[PDB]
Amino acid sequence: KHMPVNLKGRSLDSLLNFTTEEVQHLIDLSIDLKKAKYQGLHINNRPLVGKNIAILFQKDSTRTRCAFEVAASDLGAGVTYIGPSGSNMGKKESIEDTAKVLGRFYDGIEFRGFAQSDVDALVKYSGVPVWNGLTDDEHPTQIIADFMTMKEKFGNLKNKKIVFIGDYKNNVGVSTMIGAAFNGMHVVMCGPDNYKNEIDKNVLAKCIELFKRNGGSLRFSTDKILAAQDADVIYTDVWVSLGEPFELFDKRIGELKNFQVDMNMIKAAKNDVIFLHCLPAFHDDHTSFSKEVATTLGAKYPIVAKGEMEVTDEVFQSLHNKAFDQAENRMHSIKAIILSTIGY
Amino acid sequence: KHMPVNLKGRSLDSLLNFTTEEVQHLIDLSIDLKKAKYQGLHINNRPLVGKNIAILFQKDSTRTRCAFEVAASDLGAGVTYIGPSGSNMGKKESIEDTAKVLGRFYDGIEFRGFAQSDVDALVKYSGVPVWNGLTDDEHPTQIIADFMTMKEKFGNLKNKKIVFIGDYKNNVGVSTMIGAAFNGMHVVMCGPDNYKNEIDKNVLAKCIELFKRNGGSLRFSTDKILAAQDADVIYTDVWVSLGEPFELFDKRIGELKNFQVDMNMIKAAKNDVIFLHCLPAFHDDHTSFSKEVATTLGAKYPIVAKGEMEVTDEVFQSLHNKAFDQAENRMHSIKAIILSTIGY
Amino acid sequence: KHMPVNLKGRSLDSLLNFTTEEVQHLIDLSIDLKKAKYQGLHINNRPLVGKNIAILFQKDSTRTRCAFEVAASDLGAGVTYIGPSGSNMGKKESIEDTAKVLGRFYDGIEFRGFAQSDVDALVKYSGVPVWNGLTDDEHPTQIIADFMTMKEKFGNLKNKKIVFIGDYKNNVGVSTMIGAAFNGMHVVMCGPDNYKNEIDKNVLAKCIELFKRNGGSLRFSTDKILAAQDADVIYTDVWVSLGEPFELFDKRIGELKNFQVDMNMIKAAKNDVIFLHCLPAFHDDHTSFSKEVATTLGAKYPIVAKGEMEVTDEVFQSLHNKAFDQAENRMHSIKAIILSTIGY
Amino acid sequence: KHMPVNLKGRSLDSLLNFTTEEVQHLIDLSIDLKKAKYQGLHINNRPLVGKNIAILFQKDSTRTRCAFEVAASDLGAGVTYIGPSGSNMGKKESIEDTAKVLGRFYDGIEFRGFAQSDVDALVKYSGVPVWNGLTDDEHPTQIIADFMTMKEKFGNLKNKKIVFIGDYKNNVGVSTMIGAAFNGMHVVMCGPDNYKNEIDKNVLAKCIELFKRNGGSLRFSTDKILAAQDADVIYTDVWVSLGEPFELFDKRIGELKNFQVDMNMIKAAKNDVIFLHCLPAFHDDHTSFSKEVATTLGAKYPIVAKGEMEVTDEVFQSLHNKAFDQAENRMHSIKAIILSTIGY
């Protein structure tokens, strides 16, 4: 705990492997690096000239990829991008052997893919810093971006209130809960009552320990307008998982229909409440997808009849939506992570 | 609104043409650039080498000129200073033709002069960034300096209270009201009741919209000790306009005599209240001008009998006067404006 | 027009949004940059270090992609290439939302895709320079590279004569007509008389305005040998669309069979005539696709029986063929565009 | 003529002290330097770091001053601007003593003033390069800019035709005659017959000899329409010099009234004629001076009724008007002169 906040050589496999001081360091550094770029300081100060990173994506994730690509370039590192065709592991070669080779060529490795265990193998066998760019269990680069954004707005985050509403058991929802614990905030996980029973219990146990240490609290709710009361932040995510069949679509939005973020919910929160969403969001009919949803389920569920789903265009176009600031911050935060971890 | 805060190529003709996010960006950048200079970072990092700006002054304004000259130089730009003899427009050549030529030689143009319309022509016909260095209608570089100063002192400015007292219908007074709207503060425009009827109504309408969006309020007052109550900032300006004849002098100070900032007013405000003034200020008899005023009107108006006018030396020498910090900040703010607008 | 030529911050969505002076400047700047690279001046002089661009391709376009890659790299910019997987706008996210994030990350964006309105959204919502890499409607980077190539060979182009022959209603043919208008050349659009009624009538009106202003003229023709009289340039394009079905395929070559560029045509033109083709071209049976054509057709259509379609190998091997200089100039012209548009 | 072209240490006192090759060299170097600024090559290549120049203006000439200021700064030199209050030679000190001191401080001297003999003394006693910024006798920097502009439009100028029309005996007229001799052009000095008698005879003799060598011709004329036949260039200047007494105005306009440049004249020339004017031009009523003139006269002289004098606004807005390119070129041409003369 009171050793130096030295992150050289560490991997961002899960944020839970880091102290509260280390997490605050990442967030602060991010803000510093953002401020530095606006001054053009990255023109003459490129500390990773001589370094190369590989960024693997076994499923495409363009936001995370672009953030890695601009952050590394700004720092002076070469980046090689390997998409799904080359990122599939454990099939043609053991992930162990792949790891040992990547560690010979590269100074750092990003990986986005399904199995957290894949990340663990990469970390163990490569010997260089590995950065989890999203797995089934966690989205740790996104955490630094999100809480950095809230901090830019409010300053110190302790005892501030955040509601994550919707499919709160998914990787984003769970990632947000971890961030709330590290920042001593009060979280309300607002959605279907039984979702909380699907959250990995080791994660809950660790968050609980963090809340006791840092402040804030964890609470589950079933009531959107209740949850909203006194909230500084309201954070939502998609109800749908592209690639699953009509049944599960129908099922999910059936469970979720009472939890769409609308002006009602915004109005219940504080005046300065900000809205967050990792994007993309479905908040109108300007997508071919919203359309073939407003059309084929606008019957049963009138709530999606205008394309809108997890949030309404009315909320999305208001001054409360900070999702684009939050989007930009994925770059500054990933830059902080790469710098701390590779070192200047 | 939620597009990127990209100011490249924009002109600072009026601050009203900018979003609230853009205005906060300018203020924050200013603070960043100030902090950077104190570290000597401008020695090796001069992003505008290869660029030149022209700074025109059809009436002399040494504070604005020096700020432009040091800010541009620090950035690495050449500057050419054209005073009143060469800055007069529309007489010897159409301002349109002058604009089209300046835009061929220079990467940016500053202009201080009477007609806002002159600024508009420069912006339209030159095609490069134009910076209004003060016109009859507005003093937008001063706005960034002033609110930067308040922010350095208090942090976030929303719902803080500022009183602008005196000739509150003049360009400084109106400029301060715009800044208050962008920062969600409560303004009291404290002076003669009828002055409010001379304020351009399109400006009021826009400020009103900003207050509704950002917070704070607009209120007119006739009572100095009332206005002061709970104020974080008290901002004043000169009662006189050098170059007008004795009549209007006499007239103005007759209308204004009840609104001089004294220890009474300071004491009514909060303990941490700061005093602001764009300078120069008449607050003692150490000017040949205060003297031939304390002498020829000290009779009728005993309030100016010691040279003092808009403020008393007692207030000016107290720890509340931040006008010299505010003065320094004209440079850092103009540097932020030039950098954002020309780009690194 | 009296305005300074300042392309800074501009998007290249359609050449038609530019003045004649701005088009010449791009052509001349490209020639300069080509000369500067041959002297190795790009090693020590790299004006875009600290900038990053995204190049998006919703259909693969290898030639355009490489040009951007080499151009941006020579300038010192980072580039991130996103292919079809990640470039499809409007399905999983509104193009507006995507555009607003792209602009947070990148300093400029290239986009190649079917709908010109996609380019329009990118320009409106990203806030950064956007470059049309080719849409159904127009190919603006190719235009600059084409007329650059012509200028390199002939000097000032006013009143010189160009024949675009074949499917002159397609995007290359239309683009070429636009380019000729900007250069005051005489164009003859040569092929099936019907094809002229398929050209956007707004594009026609604007070209006619440019011909009147700049010189040259517009004519249509049905006879390639009469069209070739006094021609400085003969420019053609493929007869087929890959992916397109047999019927349409067969229909086109029936319509175009009399419009193949052969030595007879070359000789009807001037002695210094040059031949252009944006490439790839089918001018022999060295492609598996030519063979498939000289077989499934070519009894029915003996022109395509040796694999040659729009042009014969005899012309393609002759000193008249400048298509490879035209190809190299994709890079120099795209460099002029990035440099002008981002700025040094 | 066989001597190397080497202008190092030379003064630009009169162009007539220069060979035809030296004048072409300066025009050509002007074009090269223009192309180089557009690619950003002046950021890293500043051959005059360590040099300082003084630019003296006995009467304010804003356009020439800005050209020197920007040209020198691009090259890396410091510049000291001295206005009328400081540039009055021969009154409080001998010009010879002043020149001796200026040579001790500076590496180059610009001087703008009425007496050519003041330039001669600066040249003789300072020992450094001296550049004539404009005297009663000549405007040598303007000559290089002007003929540069013609060359950029036409290429080789030999045997091409220019008309100088109006007060052709003034320093701009005579200067244009000089530049035309050096370029082998056919000049027609068009205006009041008795003007040709006002032109220095040595100058005429020297020009005659240049035409014989280079291939132009000199010719006077009283018919604006006849003179314009087959003209590639029409160049004019103002009829009035601010500020002589009124009597001289109406005397002048009485003499010049038939020589205003109008679209009838433009149309009598070649289609590609270009119009030039060193500016400011009075071509409408957007200047206070125009109005005062359209008022006091305009009864007596109908042409000047709309504010237009030497050129009509209809021509001035035509695509023929190049005066703004001509204005930009003041800078590049002055840059060629400074660089050639101080040396790299």
Side-chain angles (χ1 to χ4, degrees):
Chain A
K1 189 279 291 180
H2 47 11
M3 287 173 74
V5 288
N6 176 356
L7 300 180
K8 263 167 127 299
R10 287 267 258 141
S11 293
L12 195 60
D13 43 12
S14 164
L15 203 61
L16 293 160
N17 289 326
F18 293 86
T19 75
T20 298
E21 293 70 13
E22 282 161 357
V23 170
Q24 278 309 297
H25 184 87
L26 293 177
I27 294 164
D28 284 343
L29 182 45
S30 295
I31 291 157
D32 296 341
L33 290 172
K34 178 165 165 171
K35 285 172 177 292
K37 190 176 184 170
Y38 276 108
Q39 294 174 69
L41 279 170
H42 62 303
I43 295 175
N44 302 334
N45 309 95
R46 307 166 81 65
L48 310 192
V49 170
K51 258 58 125 100
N52 301 282
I53 77 186
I55 68 186
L56 320 206
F57 293 90
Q58 86 182 10
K59 168 161 174 293
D60 276 330
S61 198
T62 297
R63 216 142 302 211
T64 288
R65 186 241 178 140
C66 289
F68 260 96
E69 213 127 1
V70 171
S73 168
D74 282 355
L75 290 175
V79 3
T80 123
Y81 162 77
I82 303 161
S85 41
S87 284
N88 200 13
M89 243 114 79
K91 340 290 283 227
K92 297 176 49 179
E93 179 168 41
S94 70
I95 190 170
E96 171 185 335
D97 293 347
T98 297
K100 289 177 191 170
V101 178
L102 252 17
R104 298 272 181 146
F105 293 157
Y106 295 98
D107 299 290
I109 305 168
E110 180 280 349
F111 179 85
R112 187 255 140 112
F114 305 116
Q116 183 74 21
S117 52
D118 272 349
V119 165
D120 297 330
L122 245 17
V123 173
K124 181 178 173 178
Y125 292 104
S126 83
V128 299
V130 173
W131 313 294
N132 172 2
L134 173 67
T135 63
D136 286 335
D137 302 347
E138 204 183 305
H139 200 1
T141 73
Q142 180 87 57
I143 299 169
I144 313 304
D146 301 339
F147 292 83
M148 168 191 173
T149 307
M150 306 170 204
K151 186 165 182 179
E152 275 186 305
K153 167 65 172 212
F154 302 119
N156 180 268
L157 252 34
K158 175 166 189 159
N159 291 321
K160 294 235 147 52
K161 183 185 183 183
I162 176 174
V163 187
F164 185 99
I165 179 171
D167 189 355
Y168 70 62
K169 57 168 205 304
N170 81 10
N171 49 14
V172 180
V174 174
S175 288
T176 309
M177 169 180 69
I178 303 178
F182 273 118
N183 286 272
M185 301 175 81
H186 304 275
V187 220
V188 183
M189 301 286 261
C190 178
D193 170 70
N194 44 297
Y195 282 176
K196 62 190 171 180
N197 293 111
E198 305 181 42
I199 304 182
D200 171 282
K201 301 193 161 63
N202 300 306
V203 178
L204 285 154
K206 273 159 177 173
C207 286
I208 302 301
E209 295 166 45
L210 288 169
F211 288 122
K212 291 178 182 165
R213 179 201 188 272
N214 302 325
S217 53
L218 165 58
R219 292 182 75 212
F220 293 86
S221 164
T222 269
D223 187 2
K224 141 218 304 197
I225 305 304
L226 223 88
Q229 226 233 301
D230 285 324
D232 295 284
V233 182
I234 290 164
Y235 191 149
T236 198
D237 195 31
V238 290
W239 293 351
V240 148
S241 190
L242 306 159
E244 65 184 10
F246 171 82
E247 280 79 69
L248 303 87
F249 270 82
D250 180 24
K251 179 193 187 68
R252 295 171 151 294
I253 119 178
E255 305 177 3
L256 252 21
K257 100 183 64 54
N258 296 313
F259 304 108
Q260 140 179 122
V261 183
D262 45 46
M263 278 315 298
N264 286 340
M265 191 172 184
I266 262 60
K267 255 41 226 56
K270 300 165 84 163
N271 295 319
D272 261 316
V273 68
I274 64 181
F275 167 83
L276 294 180
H277 191 308
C278 72
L279 310 183
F282 300 106
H283 63 92
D284 61 30
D285 67 332
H286 304 188
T287 71
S288 81
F289 187 76
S290 279
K291 286 184 175 312
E292 46 182 324
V293 148
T295 271
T296 83
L297 297 174
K300 317 221 314 196
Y301 315 99
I303 193 175
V304 324
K306 287 196 304 188
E308 309 179 338
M309 303 198 210
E310 64 268 357
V311 53
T312 60
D313 201 48
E314 188 184 359
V315 176
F316 210 83
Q317 307 297 340
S318 74
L319 109 177
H320 300 283
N321 186 9
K322 293 283 178 300
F324 294 104
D325 294 315
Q326 167 190 14
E328 175 187 347
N329 286 341
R330 309 244 12 247
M331 189 279 285
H332 312 297
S333 56
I334 281 156
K335 182 183 296 181
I337 292 161
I338 293 169
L339 184 53
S340 294
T341 241
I342 299 297
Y344 59 70
Chain B
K1 189 279 291 180
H2 47 11
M3 287 174 74
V5 288
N6 176 355
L7 300 180
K8 263 167 127 299
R10 287 267 258 141
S11 293
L12 195 60
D13 43 12
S14 164
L15 203 61
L16 293 160
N17 289 326
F18 293 86
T19 75
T20 298
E21 293 70 13
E22 282 161 357
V23 170
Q24 278 309 297
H25 184 87
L26 293 177
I27 294 164
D28 284 343
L29 182 45
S30 295
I31 291 157
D32 296 341
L33 290 172
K34 178 165 165 171
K35 285 172 177 292
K37 190 176 184 170
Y38 276 109
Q39 294 174 69
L41 279 170
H42 62 303
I43 295 175
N44 302 334
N45 309 95
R46 307 166 81 65
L48 310 192
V49 170
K51 258 58 125 100
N52 301 282
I53 77 186
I55 68 186
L56 320 206
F57 293 90
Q58 86 182 10
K59 168 161 174 293
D60 276 330
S61 198
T62 297
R63 216 142 302 211
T64 288
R65 186 241 178 140
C66 289
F68 260 96
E69 213 127 1
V70 171
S73 168
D74 282 355
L75 290 175
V79 3
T80 123
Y81 162 77
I82 303 161
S85 41
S87 284
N88 200 13
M89 243 114 79
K91 340 290 283 227
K92 297 176 49 179
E93 179 168 41
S94 70
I95 190 170
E96 171 185 335
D97 293 347
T98 297
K100 289 177 191 170
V101 178
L102 252 17
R104 298 272 181 146
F105 293 157
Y106 295 98
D107 299 290
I109 305 168
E110 180 280 349
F111 179 85
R112 187 255 140 112
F114 305 116
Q116 183 74 21
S117 52
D118 272 349
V119 165
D120 297 330
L122 245 17
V123 173
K124 181 178 173 178
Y125 292 104
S126 83
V128 299
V130 173
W131 313 294
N132 172 2
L134 173 67
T135 63
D136 286 335
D137 302 347
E138 204 183 305
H139 200 1
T141 73
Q142 180 87 57
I143 299 169
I144 313 304
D146 301 339
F147 292 83
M148 168 191 173
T149 307
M150 306 170 204
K151 186 165 182 179
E152 275 186 305
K153 167 65 172 212
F154 302 119
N156 180 268
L157 252 34
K158 175 166 189 159
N159 291 321
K160 294 235 147 52
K161 183 185 183 183
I162 176 174
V163 187
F164 185 99
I165 179 171
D167 189 355
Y168 70 62
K169 57 168 205 304
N170 81 10
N171 49 14
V172 180
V174 174
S175 288
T176 309
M177 169 180 69
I178 303 178
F182 273 118
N183 286 272
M185 301 175 81
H186 304 275
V187 220
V188 183
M189 301 286 261
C190 178
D193 170 70
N194 44 297
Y195 282 176
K196 62 190 171 180
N197 293 111
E198 305 181 42
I199 304 182
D200 171 282
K201 301 193 161 63
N202 300 306
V203 178
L204 285 154
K206 273 159 177 173
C207 286
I208 302 301
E209 295 166 45
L210 288 169
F211 288 122
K212 291 178 182 165
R213 179 201 188 272
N214 302 325
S217 53
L218 165 58
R219 292 182 75 212
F220 293 86
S221 164
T222 269
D223 187 2
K224 141 218 304 197
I225 305 304
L226 223 88
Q229 226 233 301
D230 285 324
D232 295 284
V233 182
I234 290 164
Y235 191 149
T236 198
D237 195 31
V238 290
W239 293 351
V240 148
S241 190
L242 306 159
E244 65 184 10
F246 171 82
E247 280 79 69
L248 303 87
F249 270 82
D250 180 24
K251 179 193 187 68
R252 295 171 151 294
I253 119 178
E255 305 177 3
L256 252 21
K257 100 183 64 54
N258 296 313
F259 304 108
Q260 140 179 122
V261 183
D262 45 46
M263 278 315 298
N264 286 340
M265 191 172 184
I266 262 60
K267 255 41 226 56
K270 300 165 84 163
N271 295 319
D272 261 316
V273 68
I274 64 181
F275 167 83
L276 294 180
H277 191 308
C278 72
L279 310 183
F282 300 106
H283 63 92
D284 61 30
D285 67 332
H286 304 188
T287 71
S288 81
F289 187 76
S290 279
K291 286 184 175 312
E292 46 182 324
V293 148
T295 271
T296 83
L297 297 174
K300 317 221 314 196
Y301 315 99
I303 193 175
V304 324
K306 287 196 304 188
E308 309 179 338
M309 303 198 210
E310 64 268 357
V311 53
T312 60
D313 201 48
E314 188 184 359
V315 176
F316 210 83
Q317 307 297 340
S318 74
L319 109 177
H320 300 283
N321 186 9
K322 293 283 178 300
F324 294 104
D325 294 315
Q326 167 190 14
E328 175 187 347
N329 286 341
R330 309 244 12 247
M331 189 279 285
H332 312 297
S333 56
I334 281 156
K335 182 183 296 181
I337 292 161
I338 293 169
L339 184 53
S340 294
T341 241
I342 299 297
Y344 59 70
Chain C
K1 184 222 88 57
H2 282 0
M3 295 283 91
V5 171
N6 182 357
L7 266 17
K8 210 177 161 189
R10 292 277 244 118
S11 293
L12 183 81
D13 40 17
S14 168
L15 245 212
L16 290 171
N17 296 326
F18 290 83
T19 73
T20 301
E21 293 76 15
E22 290 166 343
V23 171
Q24 278 311 303
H25 181 261
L26 290 177
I27 294 163
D28 294 335
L29 184 55
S30 310
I31 296 179
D32 296 334
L33 289 171
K34 179 168 189 179
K35 294 172 177 299
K37 187 164 176 179
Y38 277 117
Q39 304 163 68
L41 285 175
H42 64 299
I43 296 167
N44 297 335
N45 311 271
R46 302 161 77 72
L48 300 219
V49 171
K51 262 69 146 67
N52 295 291
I53 69 168
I55 69 190
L56 316 200
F57 289 82
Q58 91 177 9
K59 181 184 163 224
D60 285 338
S61 200
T62 295
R63 203 138 301 177
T64 284
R65 183 245 177 139
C66 290
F68 271 87
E69 213 111 1
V70 175
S73 171
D74 285 345
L75 290 165
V79 10
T80 112
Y81 161 74
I82 307 164
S85 299
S87 297
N88 198 10
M89 313 279 92
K91 321 313 172 214
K92 327 187 312 304
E93 177 169 55
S94 56
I95 190 167
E96 171 188 358
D97 289 346
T98 309
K100 295 173 181 177
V101 176
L102 252 357
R104 295 301 179 112
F105 287 166
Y106 292 101
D107 296 289
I109 300 151
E110 180 281 336
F111 178 83
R112 190 268 119 123
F114 307 103
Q116 179 76 21
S117 60
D118 280 348
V119 165
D120 292 324
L122 254 3
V123 174
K124 188 193 185 172
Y125 292 120
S126 78
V128 305
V130 172
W131 310 294
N132 181 352
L134 173 69
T135 62
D136 291 340
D137 294 357
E138 193 186 316
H139 202 350
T141 72
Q142 187 76 242
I143 301 175
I144 305 302
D146 293 346
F147 293 84
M148 176 196 173
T149 309
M150 295 170 220
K151 189 159 180 175
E152 273 190 314
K153 164 90 193 186
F154 298 124
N156 192 255
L157 252 26
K158 182 172 190 179
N159 287 318
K160 296 266 154 56
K161 166 126 118 96
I162 179 174
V163 182
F164 191 98
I165 178 169
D167 186 356
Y168 67 75
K169 63 169 200 295
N170 81 12
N171 48 13
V172 178
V174 165
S175 291
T176 302
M177 173 185 64
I178 289 161
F182 275 117
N183 291 264
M185 304 182 62
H186 299 286
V187 210
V188 175
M189 307 279 266
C190 186
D193 183 67
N194 165 51
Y195 286 3
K196 68 183 172 202
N197 301 125
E198 286 203 46
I199 294 168
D200 185 327
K201 282 162 304 171
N202 251 280
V203 171
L204 283 169
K206 281 164 181 175
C207 287
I208 291 163
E209 287 165 51
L210 287 162
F211 290 122
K212 295 180 178 179
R213 174 202 196 274
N214 289 339
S217 59
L218 181 52
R219 275 144 74 219
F220 295 87
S221 163
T222 265
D223 186 324
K224 79 192 188 185
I225 305 291
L226 265 358
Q229 180 196 305
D230 295 334
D232 301 279
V233 173
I234 295 167
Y235 192 156
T236 196
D237 194 16
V238 292
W239 291 347
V240 71
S241 285
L242 292 312
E244 195 184 42
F246 195 73
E247 309 80 7
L248 301 193
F249 204 129
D250 182 32
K251 174 173 155 62
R252 300 161 163 298
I253 138 174
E255 302 176 346
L256 262 358
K257 56 186 185 70
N258 293 297
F259 294 106
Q260 155 182 108
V261 179
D262 47 28
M263 279 292 310
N264 280 347
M265 183 177 196
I266 269 51
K267 282 182 172 324
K270 282 192 177 162
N271 293 337
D272 268 306
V273 66
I274 66 185
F275 168 84
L276 299 181
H277 191 320
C278 72
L279 257 43
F282 308 96
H283 59 89
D284 62 17
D285 70 332
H286 287 2
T287 63
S288 72
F289 171 85
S290 276
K291 282 176 180 307
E292 292 177 68
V293 160
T295 285
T296 61
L297 311 161
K300 177 176 181 181
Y301 297 123
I303 33 167
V304 318
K306 310 208 293 172
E308 309 172 326
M309 308 184 210
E310 71 271 16
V311 60
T312 62
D313 205 32
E314 189 189 5
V315 175
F316 204 91
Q317 301 294 325
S318 83
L319 58 297
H320 295 283
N321 188 4
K322 292 283 166 294
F324 290 98
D325 297 314
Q326 187 189 356
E328 183 193 334
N329 296 331
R330 295 294 319 284
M331 192 278 288
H332 307 295
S333 58
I334 281 166
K335 184 181 285 173
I337 294 165
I338 298 169
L339 181 53
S340 294
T341 244
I342 296 304
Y344 57 70
Chain D
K1 183 218 62 286
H2 284 172
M3 228 66 119
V5 166
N6 181 6
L7 273 3
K8 217 173 150 184
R10 292 280 246 124
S11 286
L12 190 72
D13 45 13
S14 167
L15 248 216
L16 295 155
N17 295 331
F18 289 90
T19 70
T20 293
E21 292 75 21
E22 288 168 338
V23 171
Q24 278 308 304
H25 176 84
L26 282 168
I27 289 167
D28 291 338
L29 177 59
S30 290
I31 291 164
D32 302 339
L33 288 171
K34 183 176 184 171
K35 296 176 173 291
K37 180 165 194 174
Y38 284 116
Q39 315 173 215
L41 276 174
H42 59 296
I43 297 168
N44 295 332
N45 314 274
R46 300 163 81 73
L48 306 210
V49 174
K51 271 61 150 68
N52 304 290
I53 75 177
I55 62 190
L56 316 202
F57 293 86
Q58 194 160 108
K59 170 164 173 292
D60 274 329
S61 181
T62 271
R63 207 146 312 204
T64 289
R65 187 247 172 125
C66 288
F68 271 89
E69 215 120 1
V70 175
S73 176
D74 287 359
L75 291 174
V79 5
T80 294
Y81 161 72
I82 301 159
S85 62
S87 324
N88 200 7
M89 322 269 74
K91 314 308 197 294
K92 170 195 175 188
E93 186 170 54
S94 63
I95 185 176
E96 164 181 350
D97 288 359
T98 297
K100 274 161 187 174
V101 174
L102 251 30
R104 294 296 179 121
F105 288 159
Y106 294 96
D107 305 283
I109 302 158
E110 182 281 341
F111 179 80
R112 188 272 116 108
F114 316 91
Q116 179 75 20
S117 71
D118 279 354
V119 167
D120 294 336
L122 254 22
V123 172
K124 186 182 167 186
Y125 294 114
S126 81
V128 302
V130 173
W131 312 293
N132 181 351
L134 169 64
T135 57
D136 287 357
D137 298 350
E138 205 179 303
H139 203 351
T141 64
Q142 181 77 64
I143 307 178
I144 310 301
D146 293 342
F147 288 83
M148 168 192 180
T149 307
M150 302 173 219
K151 181 162 181 174
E152 281 186 303
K153 165 69 183 188
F154 293 123
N156 196 350
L157 253 31
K158 192 181 168 151
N159 290 332
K160 293 214 146 51
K161 178 177 178 161
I162 176 176
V163 175
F164 192 94
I165 182 178
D167 188 4
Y168 68 69
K169 69 199 192 304
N170 76 17
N171 42 17
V172 180
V174 177
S175 294
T176 299
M177 173 180 61
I178 300 180
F182 273 120
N183 285 276
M185 297 184 67
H186 299 287
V187 211
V188 181
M189 307 288 262
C190 182
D193 185 83
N194 74 274
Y195 280 16
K196 60 190 175 172
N197 303 129
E198 312 277 348
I199 308 181
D200 181 281
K201 268 78 165 61
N202 298 304
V203 166
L204 286 163
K206 284 178 183 135
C207 289
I208 291 309
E209 225 60 26
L210 290 170
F211 285 120
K212 291 170 176 180
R213 174 201 199 271
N214 297 341
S217 69
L218 170 58
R219 203 250 243 184
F220 297 90
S221 183
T222 282
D223 187 341
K224 146 222 294 194
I225 300 303
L226 272 37
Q229 306 292 320
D230 299 325
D232 309 273
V233 179
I234 300 175
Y235 192 148
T236 187
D237 192 26
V238 296
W239 296 348
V240 151
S241 77
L242 308 333
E244 344 128 288
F246 177 68
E247 356 289 342
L248 268 53
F249 281 64
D250 52 330
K251 177 182 154 58
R252 292 174 168 293
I253 144 77
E255 306 179 0
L256 274 350
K257 72 196 185 60
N258 300 320
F259 298 113
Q260 165 185 91
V261 178
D262 49 35
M263 263 285 203
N264 283 316
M265 191 187 189
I266 259 59
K267 204 47 185 62
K270 281 170 168 183
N271 296 329
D272 228 4
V273 68
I274 64 180
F275 170 81
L276 297 181
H277 190 304
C278 73
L279 311 192
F282 298 110
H283 60 102
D284 63 27
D285 59 327
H286 296 179
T287 72
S288 75
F289 175 79
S290 280
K291 288 170 185 174
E292 299 183 59
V293 151
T295 283
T296 65
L297 319 125
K300 184 173 187 185
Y301 310 108
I303 34 161
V304 325
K306 282 181 295 169
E308 305 168 339
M309 313 191 212
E310 73 274 4
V311 60
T312 70
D313 198 16
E314 186 193 5
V315 178
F316 200 89
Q317 307 295 331
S318 71
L319 72 317
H320 297 289
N321 183 8
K322 290 297 180 297
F324 290 96
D325 296 325
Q326 181 187 356
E328 177 180 338
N329 291 340
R330 293 295 312 288
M331 196 258 89
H332 307 294
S333 60
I334 278 156
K335 186 180 286 177
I337 290 154
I338 301 183
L339 179 61
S340 289
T341 247
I342 297 283
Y344 61 70

